[PDB]
Ligand binder design. Sequence first.
Ligand SMILES: C[C@H]1O[C@H](O[C@H]2[C@H](O)[C@@H](O)[C@@H](O[C@H]3[C@H](O)[C@@H](O)[C@@H](O)O[C@@H]3CO)O[C@@H]2CO)[C@H](O)[C@@H](O)[C@@H]1N[C@H]1C=C(CO)[C@@H](O)[C@H](O)[C@H]1O
Length: 477
Amino acid sequence: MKKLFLVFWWHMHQPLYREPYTGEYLLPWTFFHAVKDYYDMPAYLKDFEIKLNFNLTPVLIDQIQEYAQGKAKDVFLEAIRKDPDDLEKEEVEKLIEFTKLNYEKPIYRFERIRELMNKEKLNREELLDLQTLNLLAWCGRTLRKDLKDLLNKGRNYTQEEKEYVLNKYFEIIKKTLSIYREIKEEGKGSVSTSPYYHPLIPILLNPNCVYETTPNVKIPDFAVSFREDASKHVELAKEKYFEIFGEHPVYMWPPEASVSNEALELYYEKGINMLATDEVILKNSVERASPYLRYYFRELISVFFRDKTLSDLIGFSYHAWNAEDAVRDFIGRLKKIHESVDFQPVVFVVLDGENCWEYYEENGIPFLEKLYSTLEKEEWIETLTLEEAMRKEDVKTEVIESVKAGTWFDGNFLKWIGNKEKNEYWKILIEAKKKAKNDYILVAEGSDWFWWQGEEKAPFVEVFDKLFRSFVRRAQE
Ligand SMILES: C[C@H]1O[C@H](O[C@H]2[C@H](O)[C@@H](O)[C@@H](O[C@H]3[C@H](O)[C@@H](O)[C@@H](O)O[C@@H]3CO)O[C@@H]2CO)[C@H](O)[C@@H](O)[C@@H]1N[C@H]1C=C(CO)[C@@H](O)[C@H](O)[C@H]1O
């Protein structure tokens, strides 16, 4: 029978929140996503007979390991552990501000949270509830089953009960890297990596790549070559991947799907056999092309193009859907894809694996469990690992000679460079790399720092600015 090959590729990344001087983690997002998604996303493979593929950045692996060993000095987390009698007025404001930010998300829908947020002042026991419910709001699928009776209480938590939650959370973190090894060794999925600190590789090699799609943009003067650092990002990433999995990575996910002719050349030289990028890149690069086909880039590397609609549905749209209606729509589009082509199509669904579920009901567990079990019983859909997709003779293959440089955000680099606020950061980077002495200059090259520049007065913009400027200063010493 004709089949549709489905490839799931989840992207797990966190910037280095660790201040180089104090060694203090200024944001808790590595810890919260570790307990909520970084372990439970591949743990689905133990309960559903499908294939899921994952990408892990080396910077996230670095932070996961530090949290697992207990060495991470997370300032926000220490306030949670601290008995509310020891909490200072400043610390309590952070806890209330954190709750206010995530108050809207369905994973924060606790009746107790409504009372505490509306209360004018909080005593010790109310703070204990606020400390623990913030912890329990980020419970993953695995620990939601184990900590069920605690989560049904919903209030009146003791300090020891809180510490039990932290203890169970740190057991998950220590096991998080093990399951990624486990799924890769057992053949249930393929695990890939990215250049170390999630940098924009095409910009590092040739900053002129921005003019490929946005010709009239004004970028700062790049008086320095970042081309050698772009190899350092790739080379050190493969070395870190070797530490975890005992082998060099053959598959890589370019950060922000950003690709270029020169970027693909550098990936090929470093032993990368396959990567993926956005289908808006496909439309800019190839005349009349389909994303449902394996692509040979100049007979050097294999490239796959994600389905932007299918991926953006999971990451942005389905959060406001019932689990049944969401999966029914998702399968319905695949059936339309199945009928639309005379060949057997391969569909690449690639997106961030941790940031959409916060806005789903029950962290999207009903959505994922319904979709994963639905895909199991659909015979015409064959979930494939990245390695399986690369050796599959049933997928059509085409040869392309060039790509127009750009990210998955509108096919251009404007979200990271182009306006005064973003251009100013690159001038800071360019001048710092002129006097850079150590490798902390690599951390400052991450796309996240330039992501949050300008845009708006979003939460933690001051914190991200503080981290980037601290890394720039440390690189010059
Ligand atoms: C402020 C924001 O911080 C967190 O974000 C990090 C994500 O967890 C990571 O996935 C990573 O995102 C990058 C992706 O890897 C990449 O594929 C591309 O999408 O770019 C992303 C950013 O460059 O790194 C992020 C930090 O830079 C945290 O998880 C998230 O919850 C936080 N969001 C807050 C701000 C808003 C804006 O409305 C809302 O999401 C929430 O109210 C806040 O929690």
